[PDB]
Design a protein around this nucleic acid. Sequence first.
DNA 1: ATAAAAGGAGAAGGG
DNA 2: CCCTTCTCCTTTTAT
Length: 90
Amino acid sequence: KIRLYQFLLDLLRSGDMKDSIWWVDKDKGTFQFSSKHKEALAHRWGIQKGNRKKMTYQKMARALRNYGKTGEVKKVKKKLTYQFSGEVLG
DNA sequence: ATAAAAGGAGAAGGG
DNA sequence: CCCTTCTCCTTTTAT
């Protein structure tokens, strides 16, 4: 199965949900969610995983915070903003 | 200042 | 094992 950090990174490279998520500094690998349209992207995440309950941003954010220990994705000091690691980017 | 929202995390449960 | 789900508390942001 696909991993969350790859689901997001795939969307940014595809632009398939430009209204829900966009780059902030492509070079630094920072990105940000749309306050109004993030739930739609969260919805698409739970479905792709076939989860029991419909996915919400809070549950997805909880999952993202776990990447803080392994380093794939760290939270940035800007609203709804995260950052990929150089390894994840290449 | 205050509601609302974003952020946080321990625990237990599910593919 | 990679999240998922629930629950409760805190900080930040929007009103």
